[PDB]
Amino acid sequence: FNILLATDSYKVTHYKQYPPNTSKVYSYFECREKKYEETVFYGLQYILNKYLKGKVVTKEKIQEAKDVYKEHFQDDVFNEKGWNYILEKYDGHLPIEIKAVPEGFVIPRGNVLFTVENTDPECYWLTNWIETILVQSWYPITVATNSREQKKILAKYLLETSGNLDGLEYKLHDFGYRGVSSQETAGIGASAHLVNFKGTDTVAGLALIKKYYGTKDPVPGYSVPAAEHSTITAWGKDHEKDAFEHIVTQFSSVPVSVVSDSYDIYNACEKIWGEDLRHLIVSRSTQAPLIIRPDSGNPLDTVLKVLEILGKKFPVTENSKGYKLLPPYLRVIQGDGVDINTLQEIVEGMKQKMWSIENIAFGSGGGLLQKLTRDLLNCSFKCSYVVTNGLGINVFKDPVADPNKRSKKGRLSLHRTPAGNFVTLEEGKGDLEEYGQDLLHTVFKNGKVTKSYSFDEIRKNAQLN
Amino acid sequence: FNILLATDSYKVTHYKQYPPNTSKVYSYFECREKVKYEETVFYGLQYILNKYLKGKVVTKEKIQEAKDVYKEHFQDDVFNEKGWNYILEKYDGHLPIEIKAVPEGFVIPRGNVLFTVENTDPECYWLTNWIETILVQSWYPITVATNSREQKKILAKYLLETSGNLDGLEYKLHDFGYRGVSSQETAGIGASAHLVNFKGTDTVAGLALIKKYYGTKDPVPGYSVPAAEHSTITAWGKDHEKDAFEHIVTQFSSVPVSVVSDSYDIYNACEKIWGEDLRHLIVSRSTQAPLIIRPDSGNPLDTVLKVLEILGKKFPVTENSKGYKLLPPYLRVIQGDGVDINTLQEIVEGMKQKMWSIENIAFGSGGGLLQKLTRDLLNCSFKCSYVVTNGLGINVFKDPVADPNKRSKKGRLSLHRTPAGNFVTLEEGKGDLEEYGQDLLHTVFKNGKVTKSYSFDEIRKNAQLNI
């Protein structure tokens, strides 16, 4: 990895475009305000450690970048001297100071989340060089936020239909490993989901958390044995029952998920699970349920019909809230077509049919880790303050046709209001001590990580009310 | 990187689930059949084969790590240590797998086999689908390359209709997506996939990926020019926008320069700053070094049309041989906000209805080009179609009652040209009848070795448009 090659091309040319005698460029990140009213701040620590800290500039990395940019631009516009300055003066450590809200913090839209500034006047150009790498923090923020919004929906309907939150942290399982754009993305996104839940198939998330954050537990997320279409269909179309019997017998004393829609989900539920193999299901322990997995058709209609079938083949109870509950050896997971909208539709449709949310879990792949963009929370990095000829000026954009893109002015700070909410003060007004101390902390300075959070602290910060 | 930790957790348990006495699992990848996206660019497998699958990928230390992690993750011992140990001792940790694939850059209709995977040692029946997770990530380069090519087709059609040729087509869609993707690795992969179709990119990560895994005869596969951002304009102060514009076009007076012009008022900047105060610095520029005015907010169509209306009243407009208006060659526009395949179509159609040549415009696309895409868009999918159990081959498949679109193919597969020059996927080993020409799938990986490679230049040639 070469930080000289990890920016937008046009930023290679920005050192020639700032006003003459600019000593300071100060920039900030927010989730701009215009429904996702509050964001989980997560993922900066990964970027600081993997890409920004320590000796990130070498002679060899400068020469590589020079040679690439000469061909890319068909011109010699690369700031070799500026990068050489960093190498010679700071042994290739970035003269940058980053301040940030603590990881796992849940902050309303339109607040400063981190600030960046150069600590050496020669390095005014470096603040926005690193915009591109720091702005990728959009992805872990957005995955963590959207996963937390789904947790709130599951909390609401579980509480209403059961009277408690038992099992909440296992109700949304990450299926997204194959559905993301890269190995690196898999680890980052899986880690962000694990801020809110404990259930994952995206193995890449475990090593990221252990290396960059840390937990008291041996692992931050868990799984159970489960079938796929290849392990049922390999038995032959006339042997689906044989495949089911073998799998639940092999995994007789742990939970096991069995995809049941290879040929006919309703037949598999009513006749195979509900008659032919029923004797192998009703004998299982509460710690080792069969989890029936549909994987096709309209997600709500399919869940409701699977539950109607099982309720007629298995002994159903009525819990203390008046909702129907399968026996504890039998559960359903809907792992197809699940995103925040269909999850809401399913739990609402289950509640209207008097089915406890105790009965159901969700798996989500592309919905959870891939079908998300930087536009969803308007994640954005902007210059708000410069010093030119020794005078500080408040800088901002304010496009005539889009007031939502107006950016904040001057030196920023994050404060508690007298009612306990968050406010971002602009124009250096934090320095009036009318709202108490800045809630941002220095997390990076001059090539060193100066403040960090365990994954356990982050989960506690990200908790639901 | 540890291939034993690079699968879906549940695949760790599949070796206990297949039928006993299974010697072979054969699986295939397609972009299942139902902007229709009728044809896909096959691109990106060679990256995965070289970075993750080839050579000694199993060691004692990787087996023990995986065992230790899975013990805690499952709260249970279920990991196939014996099976992984077998690969280490028998093959020096090289995967006993054969992958056959259509050549990279090939443009194939939906619902065709694009690659197959099978074990070459009967002990390793479980390994075929272990690597499903890593191989199915090929959805991303296929989908970026396909969606970028579908945008090239729209640009080609409107450029040809409004100008009578395709000059500059390979620079009309610029990759702005480095900050808008989910990781560094994704930036390189996605940027490389766009460069199959175009030559302009700011996503620098794409260049090193292509040089290391594919290679070009050119020194670099993609190019850029100087451009402003809001920080380099707004740093001058709100009353000095004109001073920022003047300094930037003067610094970059002999190359193309893109200047974001919407910091405060895009329409004032076009009419009064570029169109009056700094007009003398624009009309003096060479055809090889235009000013490129960049709006970046508002309704993308409305803003492009109004910018062109303003510039056409301040600068000498010609009418080309097709009857479309054309700015002078020292002045162009780039719309780089809110661009995806739908808004690109809307803008060029709106420009054509207002009699503006597509020669006047270029597009930048970030999240639309590299991020706002899922594995669902082309139904990219890997499925088992053939097993051997007690020495007898059986054709296998799924066919869910409530969704016929998820039916999978049966048996040993091959891809052929039809007598009319289309493509057909033969099932149930019927390729062996040789009623069609040669199978188009070639062995690209066997027993830990990459057996066939494509240059980036071959890939671009295979992915060309018809015209």
Ligand SMILES: C[C@@H]1CC(=O)N(C2CCOCC2)N=C1c1ccc(NC(=O)N2Cc3ccncc3C2)cc1
């Ligand atoms: C959601 C239920 C409920 C539940 O409480 N658990 C916990 C998980 C922690 O250990 C004790 C049981 N696991 C569950 C569960 C876990 C994994 C699976 N896996 C699953 O169906 N698949 C893995 C996977 C990955 C990618 N595509 C499809 C699938 C199918 C299914 C149910």
Ligand SMILES: C[C@@H]1CC(=O)N(C2CCOCC2)N=C1c1ccc(NC(=O)N2Cc3ccncc3C2)cc1
């Ligand atoms: C599309 C026009 C037309 C065109 O023919 N070119 C080619 C490119 C190859 O070299 C000669 C000129 N470049 C163009 C161009 C290149 C880069 C830019 N860059 C740009 O506006 N920005 C880079 C970038 C990245 C991330 N977010 C925003 C921006 C803004 C704009 C126009």
